[PDB]
Protein backbone atom coordinates (compact mmCIF):
# COMPACT_ATOMS: atom_id res chain seq x y z
CA UNK A 1 0.00 0.00 0.00
CA UNK A 2 1.75 3.14 -1.24
CA UNK A 3 1.26 6.46 0.51
CA UNK A 4 -0.93 8.83 -1.56
CA UNK A 5 1.11 10.42 -4.34
CA UNK A 6 0.19 13.93 -3.16
CA UNK A 7 2.18 13.28 0.05
CA UNK A 8 5.24 12.15 -1.95
CA UNK A 9 5.64 15.32 -4.07
CA UNK A 10 7.95 18.26 -3.58
CA UNK A 11 7.46 21.59 -5.29
CA UNK A 12 10.93 22.93 -6.09
CA UNK A 13 10.89 26.71 -6.40
CA UNK A 14 13.63 29.08 -7.46
CA UNK A 15 15.17 26.90 -10.15
CA UNK A 16 17.92 28.03 -12.41
CA UNK A 17 16.41 28.52 -15.87
CA UNK A 18 19.09 26.08 -17.04
CA UNK A 19 17.74 23.24 -14.87
CA UNK A 20 16.15 20.46 -16.93
CA UNK A 21 14.04 17.41 -16.11
CA UNK A 22 17.28 15.44 -16.27
CA UNK A 23 19.39 17.67 -14.04
CA UNK A 24 16.61 18.09 -11.47
CA UNK A 25 16.24 14.31 -11.38
CA UNK A 26 19.98 13.69 -11.13
CA UNK A 27 20.10 16.00 -8.13
CA UNK A 28 17.06 14.76 -6.22
CA UNK A 29 17.66 11.04 -6.83
CA UNK A 30 20.40 11.34 -4.22
CA UNK A 31 17.66 11.06 -1.56
CA UNK A 32 15.34 8.46 -3.04
CA UNK A 33 13.68 6.84 -6.02
CA UNK A 34 11.92 9.45 -8.17
CA UNK A 35 8.75 8.22 -9.87
CA UNK A 36 8.33 11.61 -11.58
CA UNK A 37 10.40 14.76 -12.12
CA UNK A 38 9.43 17.77 -14.24
CA UNK A 39 10.58 21.35 -14.82
CA UNK A 40 7.65 23.63 -15.58
CA UNK A 41 8.10 25.53 -18.85
CA UNK A 42 6.23 28.05 -20.93
CA UNK A 43 4.06 26.20 -23.50
CA UNK A 44 5.24 28.38 -26.41
CA UNK A 45 8.81 29.46 -25.65
CA UNK A 46 9.91 26.38 -23.63
CA UNK A 47 11.63 28.83 -21.27
CA UNK A 48 11.66 27.61 -17.68
CA UNK A 49 9.05 29.00 -15.32
CA UNK A 50 11.60 28.72 -12.53
CA UNK A 51 9.94 25.87 -10.64
CA UNK A 52 9.35 22.16 -10.94
CA UNK A 53 8.25 19.09 -9.06
CA UNK A 54 9.74 15.78 -8.00
CA UNK A 55 7.78 12.78 -6.75
CA UNK A 56 9.45 10.20 -4.53
CA UNK A 57 8.42 6.58 -4.03
CA UNK A 58 7.90 7.06 -0.26
CA UNK A 59 7.26 9.74 2.34
CA UNK A 60 10.51 8.81 4.12
CA UNK A 61 12.33 9.83 0.93
CA UNK A 62 10.57 13.21 0.96
CA UNK A 63 11.76 13.61 4.53
CA UNK A 64 15.33 12.70 3.56
CA UNK A 65 15.30 15.29 0.80
CA UNK A 66 13.91 17.96 3.12
CA UNK A 67 16.47 17.08 5.80
CA UNK A 68 19.24 17.61 3.21
CA UNK A 69 18.33 21.26 2.59
CA UNK A 70 19.70 23.66 1.61
CA UNK A 71 19.75 22.28 -1.93
CA UNK A 72 21.97 24.01 -4.48
CA UNK A 73 20.75 22.72 -7.85
CA UNK A 74 22.71 23.75 -10.95
CA UNK A 75 24.31 26.58 -8.99
CA UNK A 76 21.19 28.05 -7.35
CA UNK A 77 19.71 27.45 -3.89
CA UNK A 78 16.18 26.20 -4.49
CA UNK A 79 13.08 26.19 -2.26
CA UNK A 80 11.48 22.77 -1.75
CA UNK A 81 8.03 22.48 -0.19
CA UNK A 82 5.72 19.53 0.44
CA UNK A 83 1.94 19.67 -0.14
CA UNK A 84 -0.64 20.31 2.56
CA UNK A 85 -4.50 20.25 2.51
CA UNK A 86 -6.72 23.21 1.51
CA UNK A 87 -7.73 23.54 5.19
CA UNK A 88 -4.09 24.66 5.89
CA UNK A 89 -4.07 26.98 2.84
CA UNK A 90 -5.40 30.52 2.34
CA UNK A 91 -6.45 29.82 -1.30
CA UNK A 92 -6.56 26.81 -3.66
CA UNK A 93 -3.17 25.89 -5.04
CA UNK A 94 -1.20 28.17 -2.71
CA UNK A 95 1.14 27.12 0.09
CA UNK A 96 0.81 29.01 3.39
CA UNK A 97 4.47 28.81 4.36
CA UNK A 98 4.56 29.39 8.12
CA UNK A 99 6.56 28.22 11.12
CA UNK A 100 3.86 28.27 13.81
CA UNK A 101 1.01 25.93 14.77
CA UNK A 102 -2.11 26.25 16.86
CA UNK A 103 -2.64 23.21 19.13
CA UNK A 104 -6.15 22.94 20.56
CA UNK A 105 -7.84 20.46 22.87
CA UNK A 106 -5.04 20.18 25.43
CA UNK A 107 -7.28 21.22 28.38
CA UNK A 108 -5.83 22.39 31.69
CA UNK A 109 -3.42 19.55 32.54
CA UNK A 110 -1.06 19.81 29.55
CA UNK A 111 2.32 21.45 30.24
CA UNK A 112 5.15 22.83 28.14
CA UNK A 113 7.18 19.62 28.42
CA UNK A 114 4.29 17.56 27.02
CA UNK A 115 4.24 19.75 23.92
CA UNK A 116 8.03 19.82 23.64
CA UNK A 117 8.49 16.06 24.00
CA UNK A 118 5.83 15.42 21.36
CA UNK A 119 6.59 18.08 18.76
CA UNK A 120 10.42 18.07 18.93
CA UNK A 121 10.53 15.08 16.58
CA UNK A 122 8.92 17.17 13.85
CA UNK A 123 11.49 19.97 13.99
CA UNK A 124 13.50 22.35 16.10
CA UNK A 125 11.21 24.21 18.49
CA UNK A 126 11.89 27.88 19.23
CA UNK A 127 8.79 28.94 21.22
CA UNK A 128 6.06 27.13 23.16
CA UNK A 129 3.23 29.36 24.36
CA UNK A 130 0.59 27.72 26.56
CA UNK A 131 -2.34 30.11 26.50
CA UNK A 132 -3.74 31.33 29.82
CA UNK A 133 -6.69 33.50 30.70
CA UNK A 134 -5.91 37.22 30.77
CA UNK A 135 -7.95 37.69 33.95
CA UNK A 136 -7.43 34.53 36.01
CA UNK A 137 -4.23 32.98 34.67
CA UNK A 138 -6.02 29.66 34.21
CA UNK A 139 -4.97 27.55 31.25
CA UNK A 140 -7.35 27.96 28.33
CA UNK A 141 -6.72 24.59 26.69
CA UNK A 142 -4.67 25.63 23.67
CA UNK A 143 -1.11 26.53 22.75
CA UNK A 144 1.11 27.75 19.96
CA UNK A 145 4.38 26.11 18.94
CA UNK A 146 6.91 27.93 16.75
CA UNK A 147 9.59 25.98 14.86
CA UNK A 148 12.71 27.16 13.08
CA UNK A 149 11.38 26.04 9.69
CA UNK A 150 8.13 25.50 7.82
CA UNK A 151 8.60 21.81 6.95
CA UNK A 152 7.96 20.79 10.57
CA UNK A 153 4.57 22.51 10.36
CA UNK A 154 3.79 20.95 6.97
CA UNK A 155 4.53 17.45 8.30
CA UNK A 156 2.40 18.14 11.38
CA UNK A 157 -0.74 19.44 9.69
CA UNK A 158 -1.00 16.58 7.19
CA UNK A 159 -1.26 13.92 9.92
CA UNK A 160 -4.83 12.81 10.61
CA UNK A 161 -4.25 12.58 14.39
CA UNK A 162 -2.18 14.13 17.16
CA UNK A 163 -2.33 12.75 20.70
CA UNK A 164 -0.64 14.99 23.27
CA UNK A 165 -0.83 14.14 26.98
CA UNK A 166 -3.62 11.69 26.20
CA UNK A 167 -5.74 14.33 24.43
CA UNK A 168 -6.94 14.13 20.83
CA UNK A 169 -5.71 17.51 19.57
CA UNK A 170 -6.67 19.85 16.75
CA UNK A 171 -3.58 21.23 15.05
CA UNK A 172 -3.54 23.90 12.36
CA UNK A 173 -1.22 26.44 10.76
CA UNK A 174 -1.14 29.74 12.67
CA UNK A 175 -0.76 33.23 11.15
C1 LIG B 1 2.97 19.89 -4.94
C2 LIG B 1 3.18 21.18 -4.22
C3 LIG B 1 3.74 21.22 -2.95
C4 LIG B 1 3.92 22.44 -2.34
C5 LIG B 1 3.55 23.59 -2.99
C6 LIG B 1 2.99 23.48 -4.27
N1 LIG B 1 2.60 24.58 -4.98
C7 LIG B 1 2.78 25.94 -4.50
C8 LIG B 1 3.56 26.76 -5.51
N2 LIG B 1 2.94 26.69 -6.83
C9 LIG B 1 2.80 25.31 -7.32
C10 LIG B 1 2.12 25.31 -8.68
C11 LIG B 1 1.98 24.51 -6.30
N3 LIG B 1 2.82 22.30 -4.86
Curated annotation (Swiss-Prot):
Domain of life: Eukaryota
Cross-link (Glycyl lysine isopeptide (Lys-Gly) (interchain with G-Cter in SUMO2)): 2, 72, 173
Keywords linked to the UniProt accession: Acetylation, Amyotrophic lateral sclerosis, Cytoplasm, Disease variant, Host-virus interaction, Isopeptide bond, Methylation, mRNA processing, mRNA splicing, mRNA transport, Neurodegeneration, Nucleus, Phosphoprotein, Repeat, Ribonucleoprotein, RNA-binding, Spliceosome, Transport, Ubl conjugation
Region called Globular B domain, residue ranges: 89-175
Domain RRM: 8-91, 99-175
Residues modified to Phosphoserine: 16
One Gene Ontology molecular-function label: pre-mRNA binding
Crosslink site: Glycyl lysine isopeptide (Lys-Gly) (interchain with G-Cter in SUMO): 107
Post-translational modification: Sumoylated.
Subunit structure: Identified in the spliceosome C complex. Identified in a IGF2BP1-dependent mRNP granule complex containing untranslated mRNAs. Interacts with SEPT6. Interacts with C9orf72. Interacts with KHDRBS1. Interacts with UBQLN2. Interacts with PPIA/CYPA. Interacts (via the RGG-box) with the HOXB-AS3 peptide; the interaction inhibits binding of HNRNPA1 to the intronic sequences flanking exon 9 of the PKM gene, preventing inclusion of exon 9 and promoting inclusion of exon 10 which suppresses formation of the PKM M2 isoform and promotes production of the M1 isoform. (Microbial infection) Interacts with HCV NS5B and with the 5'-UTR and 3'-UTR of HCV RNA.
Disease per UniProt entry: Inclusion body myopathy with early-onset Paget disease with or without frontotemporal dementia 3: An autosomal dominant disease characterized by disabling muscle weakness clinically resembling to limb girdle muscular dystrophy, osteolytic bone lesions consistent with Paget disease, and premature frontotemporal dementia. Clinical features show incomplete penetrance.
Biological role stated in the UniProt entry: Involved in the packaging of pre-mRNA into hnRNP particles, transport of poly(A) mRNA from the nucleus to the cytoplasm and modulation of splice site selection. Plays a role in the splicing of pyruvate kinase PKM by binding repressively to sequences flanking PKM exon 9, inhibiting exon 9 inclusion and resulting in exon 10 inclusion and production of the PKM M2 isoform. Binds to the IRES and thereby inhibits the translation of the apoptosis protease activating factor APAF1. May bind to specific miRNA hairpins. (Microbial infection) May play a role in HCV RNA replication.
Annotated protein name in UniProt: Heterogeneous nuclear ribonucleoprotein A1
Residues of the full protein shown: 7 to 181 of 372
